[PDB]
Design a protein around this ligand. Structure first.
Ligand code: L2P
Ligand code: L2P
Ligand code: L2P
Ligand code: L2P
Ligand code: L2P
Ligand code: L2P
Ligand code: RET
Ligand code: RET
Ligand code: RET
Ligand code: MYS
Ligand code: MYS
Ligand code: MYS
Ligand code: C14
Ligand code: C14
Ligand code: C14
Ligand code: TRD
Ligand code: TRD
Ligand code: TRD
Ligand code: UND
Ligand code: UND
Ligand code: UND
Ligand code: UND
Ligand code: D10
Ligand code: D10
Ligand code: D10
Ligand code: DD9
Ligand code: DD9
Ligand code: DD9
Ligand code: OCT
Ligand code: OCT
Ligand code: OCT
Ligand code: OCT
Ligand code: OCT
Ligand code: OCT
Ligand code: OCT
Ligand code: OCT
Ligand code: OCT
Lengths: 231, 231, 231
């Protein structure tokens, strides 16, 4: 395990996701409100899935070698397995907060699936120049998602409770900033142009992942917006 | 890319799915009705997914070699990845049109999953005679789906709005004819008996795919059946 | 096929799932009640999926070799493909019976996904001692599911119809006993410590699978709890 310099960040990531999972699990024990239960379920599952995939990367299972540029390049494929399930759960948290219509939710989840799926294909593609074609398609799917979060959701939040409108606005802003960093790190890291070494890349993704999951969850689950308006 | 004679049909397929995706995306921009949004979301996602998988076939990612009959046989596995997601979306379009009950929808999607999954296993099976066992099981799942579309849905459409009944009937008929061709092409093509060469097989699937997705979508999204009855 | 001593149990399993599938399919033909249709759909799909995966194991497709302990160890990976889809369907049968809230259903299905997914990783892991780390995480996800079935569902059933409360209690008890055997068989069988040989392991899983699917389904589909209260 320690044979890879990036192991320290995989281990820290595993620990922080594990701790985040346990914290949300305990916190949600005292919850009976049916609406709050939905948000706790979604939000606890996110770091639990990430915990398993960080562990698989730490132990070496979630790593494969991909030939491109005349080299055997270490590619952590387990990231995409994580993201396939956790990024639509994160979007679902946002969509339920603002009572999004079903068509909009399906558009978001579908675009998200395309985003992660094409990122996976790009990560595993052996023809170097083609990796960036997949990156571009994935990034276009991301831009669609960000567009919807701003010009379909923000003006939906404003007709809702003030506490859900303010909580949505904060989580929207956190999401757009954090999620936009992922394609940049991929592009300059070992999957793309290879300018930033894998150990630093792994650190960067770990900070983004913990912030986008445990950070996000801490903000959401401390808000009164997750509860039905009750006396 | 041009090293494979079937590349021209993969390229045309990619282009037509891409163009179809953009057309539906633009067309649905001016839509606020919650019901119509569902149909636009579902129907736009279908060629978008197909676009990505056609591209993966064009670039060579979605192709593998399978030993059977003492030969290395080129198998485009990306078709099944496409179909796994797009065929239940197509069925969902039909089921929502007639306000199908939840049990019926689950039966359809489940049978569809079995249909595509067993087709994939058959496509990748190395014992030649066993490929046709999987083809038979998949075809039985197809026949179940077609049965339900006729003797569970058609008489559901007739108690609904005339515009939804007439639109459903047309899309049902398009679906049954087009979908029934797929097992025949598989059986006589490079996956099955090998009587029709891969380049012609690829052409045939491209015509079926564009018709079943973009053709289907053009009929559906031009109907007033996708809108709630409103003043 | 007969080259593997466990083939007889794979063949019997295939037959019993096939027969169970046909029986439930015929039985549900005379059903119009929308609630009952849901239970028939879910419950018929379960042995149908299991039939396909038992067949893939019989024909040899669903088997791979995994190096650990200095040996090539036969691992039937198709079990996890089965279980990935059938165990959440089984939980859905239980959850719908007691009209579980959406948050609880998502927690169950999510924990179940983690349970099966980590079992799959453990089954395919090449470092022997690490296989048991994945077994432990999977078992913890199982224990969560069993906890919810007892201390979240049982007291939900009691405020419902007596026929649904009594049917739920029986199916809950069947589920907890049968499902708890699976991690034990894995641990002592060819995936784990290797004390029980593969042919006996295969027998054990076949008895558990038929009981947990066809047995379970026979109890559920003969109950009046699956019908809406109607005059
Ligand atoms: C009911 O609605 C609220 C339940 O949501 C909360 C439900 C949770 C989503 C349940 C899912 C967590 C499972 C219990 C997962 C089990 C293994 C976990 C990964 C635990 C890992 C952390 C520990 C090992 C440090
Ligand atoms: C509604 C939304 C969910 C829409 C989803 C959007 C989605 C369509 C976007 C594209 C997804 C698609 C790229 C998934 C591809 C998975 C694939 C990378 C798995 C690895 O297999 C690739 C090659 C080795 O590189 O296998 C070597 C050759 C092997 C023989 C491969 C044969 C097995 C195939 C992988 C079977 C395909 C199954 C499905 C792709 C399962 C989807 C997995 C998940 C990653 C989407
Ligand atoms: C809101 O409900 C309506 C939105 O549906 C319409 C929503 C669409 C389903 C959004 C999904 C499309 C994504 C934007 C996919 C991005 C890449 C596409 C494959 C674009 C490819 C076509 C172009 C490259 C020729
Ligand atoms: C409700 C509905 C959805 C019901 C669904 C119906 C469904 C049950 C029908 C059968 C689906 C099942 C056949 C999927 C099999 C996928 C498999 C072909 C992927 C390729 O792996 C096959 C061999 C190489 O040929 O791998 C070589 C050996 C490797 C070590 C394989 C180990 C990895 C396994 C593939 C893990 C299994 C994961 C699940 C099958 C994911 C499902 C993928 C999708 C195609 C259904
Ligand atoms: C409508 O709601 C009730 C339908 O549920 C019942 C619907 C069923 C879930 C339909 C799914 C079964 C498909 C017809 C599967 C076809 C192949 C089967 C595996 C048949 C195998 C058994 C036989 C070959 C012995
Ligand atoms: C809401 C709930 C559903 C939550 C779900 C919980 C879930 C997160 C729990 C963990 C699931 C995760 C372990 C699935 C891993 C599948 C993996 C074993 C498939 C086989 O690939 C493993 C190695 C060979 O051993 O591939 C060799 C290297 C290859 C290059 C691998 C590259 C292809 C990757 C497999 C692509 C990943 C796609 C997704 C994992 C699809 C999920 C399949 C299913 C088994 C969950
Ligand atoms: C918890 C993990 C999260 C929130 C991950 C988010 C990841 C993305 C938004 C990834 C986006 C990518 C692209 C837009 C193109 C390049 C490849 C990706 C997959 C890194
Ligand atoms: C957009 C793509 C569509 C509508 C594809 C439909 C495909 C089928 C109905 C495929 C059916 C098959 C069988 C019935 C058995 C042989 C294998 C298949 C998968 C080709
Ligand atoms: C129809 C099949 C059923 C009901 C299978 C149930 C399987 C399980 C509950 C498996 C549990 C496992 C663990 C808890 C850890 C070890 C690995 C598994 C996957 C066997
Ligand atoms: C969105 C953030 C992307 C920028 C990442 C900056 C990383 C700077 C680290 C120094 C680069 C290491 C190069 C020498 C090894
Ligand atoms: C459902 C349509 C299946 C029939 C396809 C007919 C294809 C005819 C093309 C000629 C066959 C090529 C054989 C000589 C290369
Ligand atoms: C939950 C049941 C697990 C116990 C399984 C008992 C199997 C006993 C069979 C005898 C073991 C075979 C060892 C000699 C080959
Ligand atoms: C490819 C995996 C996509 C599914 C991820 C799980 C999250 C799905 C959330 C469903 C949202 C509800 C839509 C109506
Ligand atoms: C194996 C992939 C199956 C899922 C495909 C996505 C479409 C699912 C549509 C869900 C229909 C709603 C059922 C209640
Ligand atoms: C990884 C596969 C998980 C999906 C299995 C299919 C069963 C899903 C049942 C959905 C229950 C409804 C939740 C709201
Ligand atoms: C186009 C929608 C406006 C809100 C999205 C902001 C786009 C940020 C760009 C992210 C950088 C990705 C490379
Ligand atoms: C049995 C249901 C009647 C409607 C379905 C028509 C079946 C068409 C056969 C398709 C050919 C597949 C090989
Ligand atoms: C902790 C919840 C109480 C009900 C679950 C009973 C646990 C049975 C243990 C199963 C054995 C697995 C190794
Ligand atoms: C070796 C790099 C070749 C450049 C490929 C860039 C493709 C980016 C596509 C953006 C439309
Ligand atoms: C080499 C071909 C052997 C014939 C197999 C046909 C099987 C079809 C099954 C239909 C019930
Ligand atoms: C070779 C076996 C080494 C023992 C591993 C047991 C790990 C079990 C983890 C339970 C917390
Ligand atoms: C990680 C295993 C958890 C089993 C005990 C249940 C914890 C309490 C959860 C309350 C919903
Ligand atoms: C509760 C702490 C969980 C941390 C387990 C994984 C950390 C890796 C240590 C090497
Ligand atoms: C908008 C046109 C999209 C076409 C891109 C793929 C066509 C392949 C050209 C070689
Ligand atoms: C209807 C009987 C189904 C049995 C088919 C599979 C049994 C395997 C026989 C070798
Ligand atoms: C993006 C950083 C999130 C910070 C989380 C802090 C949570 C405290 C309530
Ligand atoms: C099956 C062929 C479909 C033809 C689509 C034409 C759409 C015009 C409205
Ligand atoms: C766990 C054993 C189940 C027994 C099923 C018998 C069904 C008869 C109604
Ligand atoms: C990591 C366990 C958290 C302890 C409880 C925190 C207050 C709910
Ligand atoms: C008003 C919300 C500001 C949140 C910005 C957080 C940036 C990481
Ligand atoms: C809305 C601001 C987006 C900031 C992008 C930051 C990418 C590192
Ligand atoms: C391909 C872009 C379509 C242009 C608009 C067509 C009329 C909505
Ligand atoms: C009355 C509907 C006829 C549609 C037939 C289309 C055949 C491709
Ligand atoms: C309902 C008519 C079906 C026609 C099947 C055509 C197969 C090529
Ligand atoms: C296996 C076929 C079952 C025959 C009908 C049983 C009574 C519904
Ligand atoms: C009162 C229900 C008892 C069911 C026990 C079944 C054990 C297999
Ligand atoms: C509730 C009793 C569980 C029995 C476990 C049996 C495991 C073989």
């Amino acid at each position: 395990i320690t044979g890879r310099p990036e192991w320290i960040w995989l281990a820290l990531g595993t620990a922080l996701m594990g701790l985040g999972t346990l914290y949300f699990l305990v916190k949600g024990m005292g919850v009976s409100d049916p609406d709050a239960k939905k948000f706790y379920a979604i939000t606890t599952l996110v770091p639990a899935i990430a915990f398993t995939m960080y562990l698989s990367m730490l132990l070496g299972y979630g790593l494969t070698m991909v030939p491109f540029g005349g080299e055997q390049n270490p590619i952590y494929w387990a990231r995409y397995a994580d993201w396939l399930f956790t990024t639509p759960l994160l979007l679902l948290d946002l969509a339920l907060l603002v009572d999004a219509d079903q068509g909009t939710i399906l558009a978001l989840v579908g675009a998200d699936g395309i985003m992660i799926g094409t990122g996976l294909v790009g990560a595993l593609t052996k023809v170097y120049s083609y990796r960036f074609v997949w990156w571009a398609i994935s990034t276009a799917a991301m831009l669609y998602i960000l567009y919807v979060l701003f010009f379909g959701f923000t003006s939906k939040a404003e007709s809702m409770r003030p506490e859900v409108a303010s909580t949505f606005k904060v989580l929207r802003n956190v999401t757009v900033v954090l999620w936009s960093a992922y394609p940049v790190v991929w592009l300059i890291g070992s999957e793309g142009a290879g300018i930033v070494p894998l150990n630093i890349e792994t650190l960067l993704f770990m900070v983004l992942d913990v912030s986008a999951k445990v950070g996000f969850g801490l903000i959401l689950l401390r808000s009164r917006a997750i509860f039905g308006e009750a006396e």
